[PDB]
Structure formats: C-alpha cells, structure tokens
Amino acid sequence: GSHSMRYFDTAMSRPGRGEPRFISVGYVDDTQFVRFDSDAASPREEPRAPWIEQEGPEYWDRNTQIFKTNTQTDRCSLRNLRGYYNQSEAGSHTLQSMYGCDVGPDGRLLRGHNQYAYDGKDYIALNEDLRSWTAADTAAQITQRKWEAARVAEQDRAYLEGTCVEWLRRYLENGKDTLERADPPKTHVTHHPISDHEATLRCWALGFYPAEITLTWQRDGEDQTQDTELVETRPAGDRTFQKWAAVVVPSGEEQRYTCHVQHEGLPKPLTLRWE
Amino acid sequence: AFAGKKYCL
Amino acid sequence: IQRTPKIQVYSRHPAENGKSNFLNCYVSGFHPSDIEVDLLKNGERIEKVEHSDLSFSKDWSFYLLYYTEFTPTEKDEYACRVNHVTLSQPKIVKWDRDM
C-alpha cells in the first residue's frame, strides 16, 4: 500500500518556568517509532517501536544530536515569532512543525511536506513543488524572504527526496510484519431503546489498523450523514483503533437500517444490521 | 542520513 | 484562539466483570497543549496513570491517551476528569461500557 513518515514537533514557551519545551515524535503511518523530549532527565532520541531498536548506537547518537540542535532552532524561532507579532514576553506561545514524505506501493516519492503553525494557525508551508513557500501573513513573509535568501527549500527538497524516502523504505522492510499488515475491524451492532417510540442503533468497529476507516449508516439505502453521531477514531493502546456510529431509529424500523464498513484489512466491505 | 535538520523562522 | 478538548472514556478490550483490562481516557482536538487528566475509581484519583507522547492531528489540534490497568466489576464506577484553559471547571465523563 501507500506509506508515510512524519515527524510532529511541538515547542511551547513558558515564561518564568525555564526555556521552551521541545518534543518531537516520529511516525510511520499510525505507528510511533521515536520520541525526543527536551524535559526528559537525560534527553535522548528513544525507540518507541520494536523494529527500530536494532538500528545501532550511531543512529541513536546522531539523531539525539539533530534533536538537541532542533531544540535550539525552535527556541530561536519562538523568539523571532514573538517579535514578528509584537507580543509581550509575558505570554506562552506554541510552534508546531510537520515534516516528512509519502511513498506509493513501489516506494517511489508521492510527495513531501514541511509546514509550520504558530498558536494553532497555519504560518508557512513548503509547496508540493519543494521549491517555493506559501506564507499565511506578513510575519510569515519575513521567514519566507529569509529562507529564500538562505536557499532552505533546496536543503529541504534534498532531505525529502533522498534521506526521508531511503529511511522510510528501510523502516517498512525492518517492520514488514506490522507496518505492512492491515488488521480488519471486528464489527457488531448494538440496540438500546431510548423510549417507547425510538431506539439507538450503534455500529462498532474494534481492533483495526491503520486508523483510516469509513463507517456509515443508511436508511432504505440512503446515507444518514446528518442524523449519525460519529465519534473520533480512538486508540485502544495495543496499536489498534476503535470507532462507532449511532443513529436514532423509530421502534419497529430497525431492519431498514444498514451499517457499511470499509477498511484496508477487509477482504470486502461489510453490510451489518441489528441481529 | 539521519532525522531532519530545522532552520530558524 | 483556543480549542476545547473532546473526551472519550472506554476500555482497550470488551469489558468482562472480573477480567483484567485497560481503562482509556482519550483527549483530542484541543489547543493549547497544557491539559490535566485524571482517571477516577468511585470518585478517587487512580495513581501512576500513564500517557502517550504529545502529538497532534493535521489540523494542529493535540491529542493524548491516558490509560491504566483495571478489572471492572458490577459495583465500581470509573470516570475521566479533564481540566483545560477553555473549561470554567473540570469536565467529568463517566465510563459507559456501550460508548
């Protein structure tokens, strides 16, 4: 199938409580494989998946160094951003970063990503061309001009087309028994009367990986998007995910409702009814 | 050949 | 601009009275990242609750999973208590085995 490698970095200032915390987490698809936290007793790049543990001591030593350097760069960025927005030294602010690569079934680059948000708002992003930037506002235009002057897009393009795709291919090979295995959902429909007139039908999906799933209710073959309560997909804590979808139905009309499930792990899509 | 270097905004 | 957490309380495995399991409190969709989460057993804080590493969705909102070992009974009530800058008081969501 298609795969992604992504690092999710958070830097958060805390005036009066030391320097900004930096945390970086790496994922292959929906599987975390590394973490760095500047607040850890002895900050190290640490393994968070079994197939990474084999990498060897230089993997750990140099990744630890790249993360410690990234801690300092994100603190520099937070100082600059406070200035660009004319903000006081009193407030806490957040810088987030997403970067990495997507590959197709043959391991070929599909697209690269390098984007940033400040206080939860999009700030700047590398365009799909990997050559040019999109800046959200006149503050991000300063970063854009600086990065154009320093030819940063060229460095990012070389990382995303070379190192990123090469490491993702090696992780997929080393973790093939888990990262290349789709676990289908286990499904059931529950029924709870709410009154004499109405009942809740709830369509369950449990134990699936990866997290991407489609769960719908239909009434007489018509999608019920507006009348369905769909909970966010949630982690079980054992690598797999859960989700449910519920509709309130008139008593006696339960068999007009079908729950439809699509997921990569299923040999074919499921149609479920109550009982 | 390791995780990504960042640049200051 | 701030975003209030969504809260879900659930078990890792289908709940069976007397069988060992994990109690999950999943908080998602929130901004900024500072959040206080407690798991409760009959109103009282559970000790040594673990959590996931802070991460976020592609809309930049944060998510965390808090979890602990537990053995459900017919008698014992479980809940999640959440505090965040968006909330005037803590939000309590009760564990319902059918949610």
Residues A89 and A107 in one domain: yes
Query: In chain A, which among 12-71 make CB contacts under 8 A with chain C?
Result: 12, 23, 25, 27, 32, 35, 37, 48
How far apart are the C-alpha atoms of A117 and A136, rounded to whole Å? 10
Q: Which residue of B has its CA nearest to A76?
A: B8
Tally of structural domains, chain A: 2
Residues A175 and A245 in one domain: no
Q: How many CA atoms lie within 13 A of A10 on its CB side?
A: 25
Residues A204 and A90 in one domain: no
Distance from CA of C26 to the nearest CA of A (A): 7
Q: Could you give the maximum distance between any two Cα atoms of chain A, in Å?
A: 71
8 A C-beta contact, residue C66 and residue C24:
yes
Q: How many CA atoms lie within 13 A of A165 on its CB side?
A: 20
How far apart are the C-alpha atoms of A245 and C96, rounded to whole Å? 16
Residues A99 and A204 in one domain: no
| Boundary-marking domain end, from A163, A179, A195 | A179
**Residue ranges in chain A assigned as alpha helix (H):** 57-84, 138-149, 152-158, 165-174, 176-179
How far apart are the C-alpha atoms of A205 and A188, rounded to whole Å? 7
The phi, psi pair for A273, rounded to 5°, reads -125, 165
Experimental method: X-ray
The residues, ordered by sequence, that sit 6+ positions from A185 with a Cβ below 8 Å of its Cβ are A205, A206, A207, A208, A213, A261, A263, A265, A266, A270
User: Residue C25 has which token pair?
Assistant: 């409190």
Identify whether A116 is part of a domain. yes
Closest CA to C54 of C39, C34, C68: C34
Resolution (A): 1.6
Tally of structural domains, chain C: 1
Our answer on whether C and A touch (3+ beta-carbon pairs < 8 Å) is yes
8 A C-beta contact, residue A30 and residue A12:
no
Is A25 in contact with C54 (Cβ distance < 8 A)? Answer: yes
Residues A143 and A55 in one domain: yes
The residues, ordered by sequence, that sit 6+ positions from C37 with a Cβ below 8 Å of its Cβ are C25, C27, C49, C51, C64, C66, C80, C81, C82
The residues, ordered by sequence, that sit 6+ positions from A44 with a Cβ below 8 Å of its Cβ are A36, A60, A64
The answer to whether A52 faces chain B, any CB pair under 8 Å, is: no
Is B4 in contact with A164 (Cβ distance < 8 A)? Answer: yes
Nearest to B6 among A73, A143, A163 (CB): A73
CATH, residue A10: 3.30.500.10
In terms of phi and psi (left: phi > 0; alpha: psi -120 to 50; beta: otherwise), the region of C48 is: left
Q: How many CA atoms lie within 13 A of A99 on its CB side?
A: 26
Query: In chain C, which among 32-91 make CB contacts under 8 A with chain A?
Result: 32-34, 52-56, 58, 60-62, 65, 67
Q: How many residues does chain B have?
A: 9
8 A C-beta contact, residue A252 and residue A210:
no
* Residue A210: cis peptide before it, omega within 30 degrees of 0: yes
User: Residue A249 has which token pair?
Assistant: 């139905």
8 A C-beta contact, residue A77 and residue A95:
yes
Q: Which residues of B touch A34 (CB under 8 A)?
A: 3
Residues A196 and A116 in one domain: no
- Domain boundaries, position A190: 186-269
Which other chains touch chain B, taking contact as 3+ CB pairs less than 8 Å apart? A
A199: three-class secondary structure by DSSP? strand
The residues, ordered by sequence, that sit 6+ positions from A78 with a Cβ below 8 Å of its Cβ are A11, A13, A20, A93, A95
Q: DSSP characters for A113-143?
A: EEEEEETTEEEEEE-TTSS-EEESSHHHHHH
DSSP state of A18: -
Q: Which residues of C touch A232 (CB under 8 A)?
A: 6, 8, 26, 28-29
Tell me the three-class secondary structure of C58-96, residue by residue: CCCCEEEEEEEEECCCCCCCEEEEEECCCCCCCEEEECC
Q: How many Cβ pairs closer than 8 A exist between chain A and C? A: 73
The phi, psi pair for B3, rounded to 5°, reads -50, 170
A110: three-class secondary structure by DSSP? strand
- Domain boundaries, position C47: 1-99
Residues A175 and A235 in one domain: no
Nearest-10 crossing angle of helices A138-149, A57-84? 130
Please return the burial class of C94, using the count of CB atoms within 10 Å of its CB with bins 0-12, 13-18 and 19+.
exposed
CATH, residue C90: 2.60.40.10
- Give me the residue label for tokens 């690269």: A112
Please return the burial class of A246, using the count of CB atoms within 10 Å of its CB with bins 0-12, 13-18 and 19+.
buried
